[PDB]
Ligand SMILES: COc1ccc2cc(C(=O)/C=C(\O)C(=O)O)ccc2c1
Ligand SMILES: [Mg+2]
């Protein structure tokens with residue numbers, strides 16, 4: 001056995017060596033004490049971890065049996081609520097309180113802006129994400145459909161000046177609405193200068209200053225013909241680049257080359273739903289990337305240095321060139337044979353992630369041969385928790401890891417995903433359980449939709465997938481999340497965050513509708529690319545999030561009844577063509593994701609749906625699709641033959657979109673491990689714990705790896 005014995009643990013050699021040779025050096029942590037602590041923590045906390053998972057199962061069975069023993073319809077919310085209280089699912093709401101989290105960076109406590117999520121196993125994506133703190137607006141407008149590709153303005157192989165003018169004019173309007181001139185418009189500016197520490201913009205027939213001179217933040221170059229002008233609005237920086245001999249500047253009335261936005265303020269390096277990591281070799285690749293990110297030396301293309309500026313008065317100052325980094329550990333469910341005990345049982349992956357990503361994170365608190373958290377914190381997102389006891393356990397785990405790492409208590413801060421029903425309905429108690437550690441709450445609406453379907457599996461058939469985004473339960477869930485955060489003092493102390501935009505090509509749609517999120521008081525929301533970060537940043541220049549949160553203080557906009565409104569489909573409701581479309585749509589989504597998961601170990605993939613729209617699919621959207629079909633199969637909406645036919649229908653189409661080093665599924669379907677994984681996720685969906693996809697995915701990916709080795 002390629003394994004190392006430490007107490008009761010047998011550690012995969014590749015992981016043991018990585019930690020000893022790469023992660024421990026520079027921490028001043030004694031290697032023997034670390035591994036002894038690994039062993040101690042795993043032995044102490046595994047039972048409670050397991051008890052919690054059994055409790056999920058106890059609760060789900062009592063709820064299953066509750067729906068089964070009643071034909072009365074539609075519902076007796078009074079009865080259902082009393083039952084949830086009786087069985088300990090719905091707990092008493094504690095008294096009001098204010099969080100006490102301290103030692104947090106300004107990007108979290110203060111700044112409102114985009115938050116980018118990226119798979120940590122892909123080093124190149126992770127580098128671009130960390131560098132996405134600044135992004136070119138002209139590139140993002142020219143490259144996407146925010147400037148429509150109408151007649152004459154489409155993208156070709158070389159610069160289309162008609163299109164670029166549209167981009168320039170779009171950016172002038174943005175500047176006008178964000179940093180207004182005293183009189184006149186940026187559209188007519190001819191140049192910029194600094195005089196007596198003030199920004200002076202030259203118009204055709206006069207000159208003007210800023211309506212708020214305080215929005216002038218700095219410049220580069222000679223004051224009397226600068227190379228760039230730096231502005232701030234709503235805590236976010238805008239940089240106007242001036243270069244008339246550049247390609248775009250030659251055509252511009254003021255020589256303006258580009259407009260740079262402070263874009264992804266923070267970034268979440270993901271070990272969970274956007275990655276596939278089923279053994280020690282996978283986790284080591286992830287850990288190694290997370291290590292180079294914190295040491296500053298990851299290269300695939302390198303990390304950016306900080307940005308240098310001249311203050312208005314004349315001094316020098318610096319701005320961060322990198323996004324402040326979070327890490328998303330896996331949650332409490334899965335184990336991983338990267339470590340096994342003497343009976344051969346796998347160790348809980350979440351316990352491992354806290355020990356190892358926390359150890360690695362120490363490097364980001366010290367100088368890189370230039371830092372992540374200047375205030376001494378480690379920022380871990382914790383997903384897929386169910387209720388305050390599960391939150392308390394995470395807090396205890398962090399305490400024990402801090403002790404093993406020699407770290408001050410409460411160094412390891414937690415971003416609470418609100419993406420499971422038992423957390424939503426006890427949200428205040430969950431925040432209280434982490435009152436000294438919590439740095440955000442975030443509505444992970446995709447996982448939350450999966451948990452909604454699974455929890456009420458037995459109640460009846462659910463509405464279609466596309467219908468879910470506007471059901472009553474989800475809008476109350478969204479508002480109740482903001483209310484609980486604001487009520488716990490998150491304003492000025494912690495982030496209130498919302499959901500991912502998954503239509504990577506529908507960027508005009510994103511600019512037009514994602515504005516709802518800061519309008520609802522969210523200080524941050526999730527984007528999947530640096531491009532999307534730059535464009536989403538526009539919404540924080542239009543909406544004053546701090547003032548919005550102020551106006552919501554004390555309001556109570558969601559009742560417990562509304563939260564508990566199950567998304568049951570009404571009588572009739574669907575025609576045959578609509579039932580067929582939803583089945584086809586779900587099967588292709590599942591197939592396209594799973595085939596790259598199982599075969600190539602890619603945890604996030606662009607997959608076109610039945611309407612040919614490109615969706616960024618990850619494990620959460622997979623949880624929704626499989627659970628929805630499982631629920632339809634369970635209540636007689638469709639038959640097992642419909643599932644099989646739809647899967648066999650869509651598989652050749654997926655094979656075409658991948659034709660790469662790719663193994664087709666058709667025509668020998670039952671010989672493709674990926675195809676059988678898709679089938680299994682639907683047919684066993686109702687039996688997976690809380691509808692989770694990781695058991696089946698991890699098993700099938702390991703099965704595939706084993707075949708590829710003989
Ligand atoms: C590179 O493209 C990506 C990367 C990461 C992603 C992460 C999520 C996600 O995790 C959503 C939630 O947690 C929740 O709704 O439950 C969704 C789409 C993603 C797409
Ligand atoms: Mg999620």
Ligand SMILES: [Mg+2]
Pocket residue numbers: 544
């Ligand atoms: Mg304003």
